[PDB]
Design a protein around this ligand. Sequence first.
Ligand code: CLA
Ligand code: CLA
Ligand code: CLA
Ligand code: CLA
Lengths: 180, 145, 741, 72, 80, 189
Amino acid sequence: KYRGLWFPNITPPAYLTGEFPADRGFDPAGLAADPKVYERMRIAEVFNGRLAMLAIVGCVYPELLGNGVWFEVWNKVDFYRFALISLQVVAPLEYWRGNGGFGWDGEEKYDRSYPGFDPCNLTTEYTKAAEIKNGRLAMIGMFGLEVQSHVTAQGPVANLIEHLRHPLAANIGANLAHPW
Amino acid sequence: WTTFYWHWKHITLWQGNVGQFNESSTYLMGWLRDYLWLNSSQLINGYNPFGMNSLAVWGWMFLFGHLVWATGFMFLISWRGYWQELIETLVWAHERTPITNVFKWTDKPVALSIVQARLVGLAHFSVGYVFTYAAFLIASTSAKF
Amino acid sequence: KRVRVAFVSNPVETSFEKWSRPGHFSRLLSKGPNTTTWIWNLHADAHDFDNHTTDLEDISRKVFSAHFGQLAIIEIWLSGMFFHGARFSNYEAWLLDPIHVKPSAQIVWPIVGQEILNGDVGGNFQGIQITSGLFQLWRSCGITSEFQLYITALTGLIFSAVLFFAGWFHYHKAAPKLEWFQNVESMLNHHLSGLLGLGCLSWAGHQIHVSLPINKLLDSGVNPAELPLPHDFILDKSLISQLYPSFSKGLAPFFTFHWSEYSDFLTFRGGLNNVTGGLWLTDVAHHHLALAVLFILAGHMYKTNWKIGHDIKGLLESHTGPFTGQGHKGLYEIFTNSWHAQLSLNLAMMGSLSIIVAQHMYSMPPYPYIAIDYGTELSLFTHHYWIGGFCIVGAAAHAAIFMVRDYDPALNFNNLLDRVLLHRDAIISHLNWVCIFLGLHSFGLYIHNDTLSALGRPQDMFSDSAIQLQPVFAQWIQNTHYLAPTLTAFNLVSPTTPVWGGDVVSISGKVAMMPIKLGTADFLVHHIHAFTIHVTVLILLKGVLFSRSSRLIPDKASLGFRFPCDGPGRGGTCQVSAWDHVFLGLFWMYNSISVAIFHFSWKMQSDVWGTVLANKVSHITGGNFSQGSLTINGWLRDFLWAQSSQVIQSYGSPLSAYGLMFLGAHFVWAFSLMFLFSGRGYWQELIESIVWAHNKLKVAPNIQPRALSITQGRAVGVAHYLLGGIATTWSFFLARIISVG
Amino acid sequence: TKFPKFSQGLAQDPTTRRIWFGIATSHDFESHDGMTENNLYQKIFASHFGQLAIIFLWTSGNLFHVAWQGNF
Amino acid sequence: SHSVKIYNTCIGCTQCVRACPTDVLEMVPWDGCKAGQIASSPRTEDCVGCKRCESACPTDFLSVRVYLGSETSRSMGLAY
Amino acid sequence: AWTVPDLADALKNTSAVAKAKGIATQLPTFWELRDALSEVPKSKFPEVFASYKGSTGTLLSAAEKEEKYVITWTSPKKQIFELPTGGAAEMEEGENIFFFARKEQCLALGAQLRTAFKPRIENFQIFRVFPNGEVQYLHPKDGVFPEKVNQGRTKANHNPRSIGENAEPASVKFTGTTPKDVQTEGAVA
Ligand code: CLA
Ligand code: CLA
Ligand code: CLA
Ligand code: CLA
């Protein structure tokens, strides 16, 4: 099980053996040294990633369609109604995800990271790594969107188009040199 | 040739200017210019950027005829082996593309036969010939009368 | 040492004997005719040198000598153009009034009424208006007299004789050996540094010393009769000093590397002259001089006789990565033993170069007064586009001849060429998908618009006033090219052309160049172009990769490059050969170029060419391309039907020859279908009944009439189709743009 | 497969040829498998009745649509 | 399957046999010609219908003759 | 004498069978190759690539479900030949085995073996292999190449007339026969 590392000549932690997808020997802050936490962290990493992937497409695509910018949506949409209705809808779904099924004791023991919602039988220890890596990329992206929202105060497609039109007058250097 | 002559001869008699046919019909640029080119003006304006009139159906059937006639030339000019070798590569791509493979044919895809394609070419050619002329004949006569 | 001239004296005897023995070159043809098939075979097989002999030395010799004959015929053709220009033209009249006099260099004799073709072109002259750009090219050279045109035409005829001589000499008297021909590093060094390097230096020399003064004086209205002759600029340095004062410093700046002293004739301004509408000749001089330096440098890169330089075989063998097996190994042997491989690569490049020439010469008009000659502009674009398409299809032909005739499996084991052939079903199948996808999402959009227009729903159309498809990348590129003189090409004054943006260049009233803007219509045509090129690659590449074998026929190579079929079994195997792929690619190249030149003609007539009054620009078709081109009906109505009025109303005028050529070409095109849609079984049985009647009246011929072969029928069919199609467009284009513009 | 049932040769073909050549030979009754002169004349006679009915239905539809939707 | 028949005008030149790409024909002994061999077609289930044999035959109106018939996967030349 | 050979005796040589299976496999899906490259360091990248040895011209699914063909021969030297399915391969000194999907591809390679090598290879044997496991020997069917006349062969599909002596189709109408199969000696199915 050869695997690459996140920084050239480092040595991986001893609890990261490559046994799991998208392991690149990266845990300097030692947050997965205990195995049971490493189990939950693994579920959390895939779930934050999946949500960032949905989020970043959700943030970009309506702005491409001219339906508005993602961080200005709350002057046309009421947040509190949206969030009430969303939590009503989401709650039994999240419940069942954490529960492992519909039963009170779990019963119908399902994988809460990788359930079988796959009609194309595409699941391998490789596609798992691709899902993780795409997710990590999207999480970094959604971090970018939020910081860019605050610093430049324009949307992300606008930010891209500005960089393409004026690469020297629209970059992190120029935008942070000024008061912002 | 017989219907073009009948049409142009009547269209000029009915409009009164039989001179047009008498003068122009002796050379082929006359047929092209004073029959085909001139009497296609309203037909090809059936739908324009400004709007559309009831000649828009014959306009569209006129271009449809052009397309069906031209599609017949593919069958009449390119012959079978070309297509049999291309279809072999598509059968390979279907068999080797994952997920999709599970859809299997019951009848092995092959290229049309030699006679078959002569017939299909002739049928495209005939339908387009008829549909184009009927569009032109009805739209031109109905436009001016 | 190693690179050396090596030859053989007197290897072939000059005699008219074999001239009197047709077919001599073939073992089969030399037995004489028995059927008419022989005659056709004699013409079809004449230049196929690798089917005459097996010796590669004898083939190389024939090739070299044939090349001299081609140069001789080109030189006759040029000499003709100069002579017609000196003796039957209005070049001296046009030189006084370029804007009003129309260039003409073909007069017709009065017989049977044809004198009507001698039109009123100006300069007290009657003749046929020419659209080749010669007069503008001559003016740019500095030619002002007919005497100079005469001298050039005589020198060229002598030079043509000398080249015919060289061909005879280098074949019959002193023929090089194969070792000579195989010195590819010497050849590259000489052709880059000598032919292109010194050629550019020499021509920069002519420009600096002859074309720049004479044009500078002429653009300041100096009447060509009282211009100095070109040597006068060389002998008297005071003449050229008045125009460019740097010459007063002579060659001292050059040798002390103070080259900035020559910045008055070696500029970098960019854009068009405001008087002539051409590029600035001082730029053209700097361009050619910079090229010279780079070509002379480049030709110093390969090793010949002196221990410095790169070895090409090494260079190729060095570049090998992991996906590609043994990599570029074996190619050096292919490119120094196969003439067909070289001819393939060189035709692909020559064809691609012709198309680049076409696209670069309309946007950056290089000759004085050529941009406001709209007939020239349209002609040269179209000409160079056709030449390009033909060469590319030839490149595919000769590649397939290489695979069938000169491919050695042994010398190509697990290199790139072998790996290509191991995944040829993946290559063709992906190309197939891309072609279907581009077909549906491009021509499907026109069918969409036509249908929704006809249904009375124009707000559902793909249009600039509807569902927009904007070409945003090309717009981005245009903007960047327009701003370039301010940061990324700082030392440039103006951008390379008005096309990128800015103001209208207009000589007299007429527009030379003006910005070309892109929107939905430009998007759809561009994706139609991408579709038709992809399909042509699909047909040609399939023919090259499946030339030796396929699932259908395992032993195609043994049947050869050109064979009609392998019989009616396996479902039918008509047209499996690689030759038959070149035949179908000719039709798709015809379709592709035809759409491109229609795009150009309509876009230029609608959005660039016209007349300026103050600042308002009145285009020839009044901006109907942007809306009118979004349906097939609009292409038929606003282009084909409307712009065809000039050619069909040309009888009784000096444009009537275009009217006749328009009908004649429609005829030849339809005649081609008799060959393309039938087969020789029918014709051979009809010829049997005709041969009966000749037999009954004892006048049957001894050379037995045979119907043409399958291959020849296909060849005749595509020849007459391509001729009739292209000539039709030629008539229609010239009659239109000679009348209106 | 099964279609076309009048030709075993075609109905053994494992390709898409079977379909196309099945449609194109369906009315050529002489070339059908195990065709006799009696059976040939009797299928011709019936098909003739079928053509007649199609013609009378066509006329009936012209009359109907003109009576219902026209302006006679 | 296609049907390949041999007629008595054969002169036993073996050219058809050499031409055939799917080994359908062979030479068997005969006394009707000087070469003392005739062509025969035992394996006509393997005939693809190419008619290469008829192109090879040098007799005036061929002695070998291929009548195309019903298609199979073998006769249709299919690798799928 | 000559006896009908067996593929089993040919297939005993495990190296030659391995090679045959190697070469008659399809090229891998991009996904699979990506995974293989993913499990090795960079230095070992060409070894992964060197592990594939097939093409896209090889057997598809019909071979598994209908029939495949096998050619065997013995070469005197290690030499490169051209596959009838596109591309090149190496014959080893000794026994070679190769799988193909049609009989025409087999015989095409056979034809190349008998023309394009300086010690000519004449000893190839072609077999048809069914999915169940029956192996039918095909060529040369009786030990002698079919262009050479051999005793024991019989006439098949001989018509004892010239072609002009066939009947007219209008004379055998509604009888179930054609003119071409009247009085045919050795009429096969
Ligand atoms: C001047 C007299 C002369 C004579 C008597 C010979 C004699 C011979 N040559 Mg040599 N040759 C000559 C000049 C001569 N050549 C020149 C000038 C060159 C340079 C081109 C050559 C280059 C050459 C080569 C490469 C070969 C020969 C060969 C031969 C032998 C056979 C030639 C033959 O039968 O074709 C007679 C053919 C013609 C009369 C056709 C001429 C086509 C000319 C070149 C171009 C015409 C294009 C024209 C403008 C038409 C365009 C289209 C039209 C519709 C307008 C014969 C010994 C051949 C040989 O050795 O075979 C073994 C051979 O391969 N010669
Ligand atoms: C530098 C360019 C170049 C060169 C040197 C060659 C050389 C050759 N070609 Mg290649 N080829 C080229 C470009 C070239 N070709 C291009 C552009 C195409 C695409 C059209 C081809 C497509 C091609 C094919 C398909 C074949 C060749 C073949 C050949 C070989 C024999 C040619 C022959 O005997 O014809 C003798 C010449 C003729 C019969 C003249 C034909 C006249 C044409 C059809 C009409 C011209 C019309 C005219 C311009 C205008 C109208 C005339 C007027 C009277 C109405 C020869 C090696 C052949 C081969 O197999 O060799 C292995 C072959 O089959 N070529
Ligand atoms: C107008 C005449 C015509 C047409 C329409 C075609 C069409 C085609 N040719 Mg043929 N061809 C022609 C003349 C024509 N050819 C001629 C004259 C020859 C010379 C002999 C050839 C020789 C030839 C060769 C050699 C090849 C082609 C290929 C193709 C296919 C290209 C792939 C493609 O674009 O499919 C997309 C289909 C079209 C663009 C056809 C129109 C489809 C319409 C717009 C859609 C129909 C409505 C649909 C029901 C709507 C669904 C969506 C909607 C609800 C939103 C295509 C089927 C190539 C091919 O098959 O490669 C894959 C190929 O290799 N052709
Ligand atoms: C025989 C030729 C014929 C044709 C071409 C048509 C055509 C049409 N009918 Mg009409 N129809 C017909 C006979 C015909 N009808 C007769 C005889 C009656 C009286 C029973 C009707 C009663 C009728 C009604 C109430 C309506 C139509 C309508 C229509 C239009 C849409 C199709 C439809 O909805 O009909 C559906 C079909 C029927 C209701 C019954 C049709 C009975 C005929 C005989 C069908 C068989 C035709 C033919 C023999 C089949 C052979 C073809 C085969 C070889 C491939 C279409 C113009 C609709 C309309 O007006 O839209 C504007 C509509 O509402 N038709």
